[PDB]
């Protein structure tokens, strides 16, 4: 539930199994990595 | 240029308005190369990513 | 090379550091 797939579009920091919702530049759609 | 317009412009140390021209060059570099060009590059790279 | 700009920049830096 709270955990999300690897490259799933997450919402904020943590809230995922990879626990890092970093974004690769000047764009939206933060994803877990 | 990669370092602002001041690279091609003559040194204002020996002339008047030295501080004004230095501030102008610094703000031009900051607002063009550091910000706008980086934003464009980030847009393209993040679109590819 | 005028000291007025240096004084203004130092005052601004000190004000932003204190706040």
PDB file of C-alpha atoms in Angstrom:
ATOM      1  CA  UNK A   1       0.000   0.000   0.000  1.00  0.00           C
ATOM      2  CA  UNK A   2       2.284   2.758   1.250  1.00  0.00           C
ATOM      3  CA  UNK A   3       5.257   1.275  -0.603  1.00  0.00           C
ATOM      4  CA  UNK A   4       5.308   1.884  -4.351  1.00  0.00           C
ATOM      5  CA  UNK A   5       6.945   0.087  -7.309  1.00  0.00           C
ATOM      6  CA  UNK A   6      10.521   1.042  -8.222  1.00  0.00           C
ATOM      7  CA  UNK A   7       9.808   3.582 -10.985  1.00  0.00           C
ATOM      8  CA  UNK A   8       6.233   4.337  -9.921  1.00  0.00           C
ATOM      9  CA  UNK A   9       5.223   7.999  -9.863  1.00  0.00           C
ATOM     10  CA  UNK A  10       5.489   8.789  -6.151  1.00  0.00           C
ATOM     11  CA  UNK A  11       4.249  11.810  -4.190  1.00  0.00           C
ATOM     12  CA  UNK A  12       6.866  12.869  -1.609  1.00  0.00           C
ATOM     13  CA  UNK A  13       9.988  11.711   0.197  1.00  0.00           C
ATOM     14  CA  UNK A  14       9.702   8.222   1.707  1.00  0.00           C
ATOM     15  CA  UNK A  15       6.213   6.773   0.935  1.00  0.00           C
ATOM     16  CA  UNK A  16       8.065   4.177  -1.157  1.00  0.00           C
ATOM     17  CA  UNK A  17      10.238   1.101  -0.762  1.00  0.00           C
ATOM     18  CA  UNK A  18      13.222   2.876  -2.310  1.00  0.00           C
ATOM     19  CA  UNK A  19      12.556   5.750   0.135  1.00  0.00           C
ATOM     20  CA  UNK A  20      14.150   8.320  -2.218  1.00  0.00           C
ATOM     21  CA  UNK A  21      11.805  10.351  -4.437  1.00  0.00           C
ATOM     22  CA  UNK A  22      14.379  12.288  -6.427  1.00  0.00           C
ATOM     23  CA  UNK A  23      13.635  14.057  -9.715  1.00  0.00           C
ATOM     24  CA  UNK A  24      16.100  14.033 -12.607  1.00  0.00           C
ATOM     25  CA  UNK A  25      16.097  17.752 -13.389  1.00  0.00           C
ATOM     26  CA  UNK A  26      13.694  20.618 -14.131  1.00  0.00           C
ATOM     27  CA  UNK A  27      10.453  18.673 -14.456  1.00  0.00           C
ATOM     28  CA  UNK A  28       7.614  17.238 -12.359  1.00  0.00           C
ATOM     29  CA  UNK A  29       6.681  13.567 -11.817  1.00  0.00           C
ATOM     30  CA  UNK A  30       8.944  12.688  -8.906  1.00  0.00           C
ATOM     31  CA  UNK A  31       9.681   8.956  -8.973  1.00  0.00           C
ATOM     32  CA  UNK A  32      11.286   6.524  -6.560  1.00  0.00           C
ATOM     33  CA  UNK A  33      14.847   5.536  -7.434  1.00  0.00           C
TER      34      UNK A  33
ATOM     35  CA  UNK B   1      30.698  32.508 -23.830  1.00  0.00           C
ATOM     36  CA  UNK B   2      30.292  30.407 -20.682  1.00  0.00           C
ATOM     37  CA  UNK B   3      31.626  33.164 -18.425  1.00  0.00           C
ATOM     38  CA  UNK B   4      29.448  36.138 -19.298  1.00  0.00           C
ATOM     39  CA  UNK B   5      29.793  38.951 -21.804  1.00  0.00           C
ATOM     40  CA  UNK B   6      32.740  40.386 -19.854  1.00  0.00           C
ATOM     41  CA  UNK B   7      35.206  38.030 -21.542  1.00  0.00           C
ATOM     42  CA  UNK B   8      34.976  39.931 -24.843  1.00  0.00           C
ATOM     43  CA  UNK B   9      34.330  43.372 -23.324  1.00  0.00           C
ATOM     44  CA  UNK B  10      37.368  45.432 -22.354  1.00  0.00           C
ATOM     45  CA  UNK B  11      38.421  45.598 -18.711  1.00  0.00           C
ATOM     46  CA  UNK B  12      36.641  48.501 -16.942  1.00  0.00           C
ATOM     47  CA  UNK B  13      39.299  48.709 -14.206  1.00  0.00           C
ATOM     48  CA  UNK B  14      41.130  51.538 -15.973  1.00  0.00           C
ATOM     49  CA  UNK B  15      37.956  53.477 -16.815  1.00  0.00           C
ATOM     50  CA  UNK B  16      34.981  54.946 -14.987  1.00  0.00           C
ATOM     51  CA  UNK B  17      31.869  53.002 -13.939  1.00  0.00           C
ATOM     52  CA  UNK B  18      34.081  50.077 -12.925  1.00  0.00           C
ATOM     53  CA  UNK B  19      31.841  48.868 -10.089  1.00  0.00           C
ATOM     54  CA  UNK B  20      28.678  49.370 -12.153  1.00  0.00           C
ATOM     55  CA  UNK B  21      30.078  47.396 -15.089  1.00  0.00           C
ATOM     56  CA  UNK B  22      31.393  44.645 -12.796  1.00  0.00           C
ATOM     57  CA  UNK B  23      27.948  44.301 -11.202  1.00  0.00           C
ATOM     58  CA  UNK B  24      26.374  44.307 -14.673  1.00  0.00           C
ATOM     59  CA  UNK B  25      28.672  41.508 -15.857  1.00  0.00           C
ATOM     60  CA  UNK B  26      28.120  39.460 -12.691  1.00  0.00           C
ATOM     61  CA  UNK B  27      24.333  39.735 -12.881  1.00  0.00           C
ATOM     62  CA  UNK B  28      24.357  39.010 -16.630  1.00  0.00           C
ATOM     63  CA  UNK B  29      26.381  35.840 -16.073  1.00  0.00           C
ATOM     64  CA  UNK B  30      24.195  34.754 -13.150  1.00  0.00           C
ATOM     65  CA  UNK B  31      20.877  35.443 -14.895  1.00  0.00           C
ATOM     66  CA  UNK B  32      21.882  34.027 -18.317  1.00  0.00           C
ATOM     67  CA  UNK B  33      24.368  31.163 -18.026  1.00  0.00           C
ATOM     68  CA  UNK B  34      23.781  29.947 -14.465  1.00  0.00           C
ATOM     69  CA  UNK B  35      19.987  30.241 -14.584  1.00  0.00           C
ATOM     70  CA  UNK B  36      18.386  30.394 -18.031  1.00  0.00           C
ATOM     71  CA  UNK B  37      20.782  28.208 -20.032  1.00  0.00           C
ATOM     72  CA  UNK B  38      20.900  25.686 -17.188  1.00  0.00           C
ATOM     73  CA  UNK B  39      17.088  25.687 -17.077  1.00  0.00           C
ATOM     74  CA  UNK B  40      16.857  25.002 -20.822  1.00  0.00           C
ATOM     75  CA  UNK B  41      19.444  22.220 -20.592  1.00  0.00           C
ATOM     76  CA  UNK B  42      17.671  20.716 -17.588  1.00  0.00           C
ATOM     77  CA  UNK B  43      14.358  20.820 -19.441  1.00  0.00           C
ATOM     78  CA  UNK B  44      15.790  18.892 -22.394  1.00  0.00           C
ATOM     79  CA  UNK B  45      17.738  16.397 -20.268  1.00  0.00           C
ATOM     80  CA  UNK B  46      14.836  15.737 -17.894  1.00  0.00           C
ATOM     81  CA  UNK B  47      12.468  15.309 -20.836  1.00  0.00           C
ATOM     82  CA  UNK B  48      14.791  12.621 -22.207  1.00  0.00           C
ATOM     83  CA  UNK B  49      15.123  11.052 -18.763  1.00  0.00           C
TER      84      UNK B  49
ATOM     85  CA  UNK C   1      37.104  51.104  -6.793  1.00  0.00           C
ATOM     86  CA  UNK C   2      34.731  52.894  -4.410  1.00  0.00           C
ATOM     87  CA  UNK C   3      34.163  51.921  -0.781  1.00  0.00           C
ATOM     88  CA  UNK C   4      30.451  52.830  -0.817  1.00  0.00           C
ATOM     89  CA  UNK C   5      29.515  49.651  -2.696  1.00  0.00           C
ATOM     90  CA  UNK C   6      31.659  47.567  -0.337  1.00  0.00           C
ATOM     91  CA  UNK C   7      29.972  49.143   2.694  1.00  0.00           C
ATOM     92  CA  UNK C   8      26.511  48.539   1.224  1.00  0.00           C
ATOM     93  CA  UNK C   9      27.285  44.902   0.394  1.00  0.00           C
ATOM     94  CA  UNK C  10      28.797  44.267   3.835  1.00  0.00           C
ATOM     95  CA  UNK C  11      25.782  45.850   5.539  1.00  0.00           C
ATOM     96  CA  UNK C  12      23.389  43.732   3.466  1.00  0.00           C
ATOM     97  CA  UNK C  13      25.368  40.565   4.228  1.00  0.00           C
ATOM     98  CA  UNK C  14      25.411  41.326   7.958  1.00  0.00           C
ATOM     99  CA  UNK C  15      21.682  42.106   7.955  1.00  0.00           C
ATOM    100  CA  UNK C  16      20.836  38.846   6.185  1.00  0.00           C
ATOM    101  CA  UNK C  17      23.176  36.896   8.487  1.00  0.00           C
ATOM    102  CA  UNK C  18      21.624  38.340  11.654  1.00  0.00           C
ATOM    103  CA  UNK C  19      18.089  37.653  10.400  1.00  0.00           C
TER     104      UNK C  19
END
